[PDB]
Amino acid sequence: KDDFAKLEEQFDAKLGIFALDTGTNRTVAYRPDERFAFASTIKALTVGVLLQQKSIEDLNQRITYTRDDLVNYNPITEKHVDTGMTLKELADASLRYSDNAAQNLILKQIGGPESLKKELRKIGDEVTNPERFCPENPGETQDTSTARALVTSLRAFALEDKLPSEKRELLIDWMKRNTTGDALIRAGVPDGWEVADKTGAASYGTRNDIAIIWPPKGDPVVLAVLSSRDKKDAKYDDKLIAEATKVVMKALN
Ligand SMILES: CC1=C(C(=O)O)N[C@@H]([C@@H](C=O)NC(=O)Cc2cccs2)SC1
Numbered sequence: 356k357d358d359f360a361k362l363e364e365q366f367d368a369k370l371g372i373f374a375l376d377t378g379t380n381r382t383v384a385y386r387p388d389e390r391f392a393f394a395s396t397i398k399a400l401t402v403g404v405l406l407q408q409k410s411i412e413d414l415n416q417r418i419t420y421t422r423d424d425l426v427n428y429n430p431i432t433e434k435h436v437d438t439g440m441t442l443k444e445l446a447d448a449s450l451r452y453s454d455n456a457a458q459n460l461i462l463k464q465i466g467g468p469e470s471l472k473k474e475l476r477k478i479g480d481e482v483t484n485p486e487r488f489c490p491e492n493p494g495e496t497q498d499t500s501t502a503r504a505l506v507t508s509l510r511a512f513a514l515e516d517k518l519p520s521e522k523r524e525l526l527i528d529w530m531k532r533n534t535t536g537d538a539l540i541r542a543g544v545p546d547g548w549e550v551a552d553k554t555g556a557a558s559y560g561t562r563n564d565i566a567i568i569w570p571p572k573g574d575p576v577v578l579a580v581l582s583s584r585d586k587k588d589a590k591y592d593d594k595l596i597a598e599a600t601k602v603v604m605k606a607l608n
Pocket residue numbers: 394395396427428453455491535553554555556557558
């Protein structure tokens with residue numbers, strides 16, 4: 356759409372867009388197969404894999420960690436080095452706060468980046484490219500994915516048959532109660548419409564959000580809005596994501 360082109364113009368950015376209405380199979384797409392750094396959006400898919408690997412009771416396993424496991428942003432993990440945290444608590448911290456140390460701890464428990472990639476290939480994701488911890492130039496392929504691949508993989512875990520219903524419920528609930536995305540996809544969606552999302556931010560002004568959006572009534576939409584900019588130290592604007600989401604909803608409604 357020229358509306359997506361206008362936003363790229365307005366915000367001096369590159370936009371990556373894929374949306375799928377699961378009720379009608381109607382699609383919206385702008386650079387849907389273009390690679391962007393996935394940043395923290397990978398945390399959603401990581402918990403997907405963790406849930407697939409553990410019974411719900413297994414999530415109560417206590418993980419002990421050290422101050423050495425702490426990285427750049429540890430909002431929940433910094434508060435519990437002495438007592439440790441359960442896998443369930445770590446998943447909550449990772450998804451709802453984008454706790455980087457929590458993600459690293461979980462990634463360690465599922466066998467590292469190489470193991471995550473293998474499990475993603477197993478669900479049919481041949482594009483998402485986990486390679487390093489955390490993670491996080493143009494245009495290398497690590498650690499990247501596309502808008503299309505991200506909605507496909509998110510839909511697989513949360514809405515389809517890569518997880519049983521009770522584990523599906525956990526993933527969806529954590530993402531519904533995310534604290535980090537109020538100004539992104541949530542801001543571009545109509546009032547009283549449930550949103551489950553996971554945000555991302557990274558170098559080259561990379562600003563991402565992936566989401567499942569429920570109507571009042573009807574089948575959910577799943578959406579990826581990815582973005583990046585020219586310079587390594589470029590700053591992002593959340594409004595780009597919110598506005599892109601409005602454009603997507605208009606083209607679907
Ligand atoms: C802003 C932010 C998020 C997010 O909104 O999801 N996620 C965490 C992570 C994932 O993208 N980003 C980084 O570790 C890299 C950055 C640090 C601070 C500004 S970007 S830390 C910072």
